[PDB]
Design an enzyme around this catalytic site. Sequence first.
Site: not given
Ligand SMILES: C[S@@+](CC[C@H](N)C(=O)[O-])C[C@H]1O[C@@H](n2cnc3c(N)ncnc32)[C@H](O)[C@@H]1O
Length: 209
Positions: A47, A83, A148
């Site tokens: 978060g 998701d 990203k």
């Molecule tokens: C790089 S982290 C995000 C970090 C965030 N921007 C922060 O500063 O805390 C990527 C996230 O994408 C989530 N993720 C991957 N596929 C997803 C999906 N289909 N739906 C929701 N979240 C997803 C993962 O659970 C992970 O928590």
Amino acid sequence: RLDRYYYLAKEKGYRARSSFKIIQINEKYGHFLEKSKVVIDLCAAPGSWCQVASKLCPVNSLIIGVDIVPMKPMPNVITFQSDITTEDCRSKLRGYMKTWKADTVLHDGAPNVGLGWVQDAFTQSQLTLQALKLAVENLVVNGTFVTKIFRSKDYNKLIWVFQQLFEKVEATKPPASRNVSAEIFVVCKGFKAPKRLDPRLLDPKEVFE
Ligand SMILES: C[S@@+](CC[C@H](N)C(=O)[O-])C[C@H]1O[C@@H](n2cnc3c(N)ncnc32)[C@H](O)[C@@H]1O
């Protein structure tokens, strides 16, 4: 890695080093967060981008974060589990949004389950297209979309689709991303808000060949 940005973020109370990536992008691309009374943060856990938005957005702003994994609560930030590729997420977001449109949609998604380099890049590209589809449904005219994106054989196709829907589309790699080889960030400004939206412009079967 466990570098300067990791420890600065800890000391400032940010939940993740990646906080600095959006802080730096926001500082270079016109402080869009400070102008955003509604922000959607996609793939938000733990978060730290929600924390950035909470700090920089006007007071009383609506900030919504979604991730598959549960996020610990943050004051004056809405988070929920879904998701982003599903109708479930599409429906939950619409309940929180009510009559509002978003000024900015953020996306920092990346696959959790490793499936090898080629398929991880494709999963990430699918995430980016779904995040774009959610941004197209929720952004106000002239709104901003930051995502990203992994360097891959589908990067160019996603950029092209972006260019159909935004006045300006620019790739960037902020200092806190310097040593993260997989990733680029794309800042999309000036959402066109088309009256006529092409289903194919967001159809994965059409976008990905
Ligand atoms: C790089 S982290 C995000 C970090 C965030 N921007 C922060 O500063 O805390 C990527 C996230 O994408 C989530 N993720 C991957 N596929 C997803 C999906 N289909 N739906 C929701 N979240 C997803 C993962 O659970 C992970 O928590």
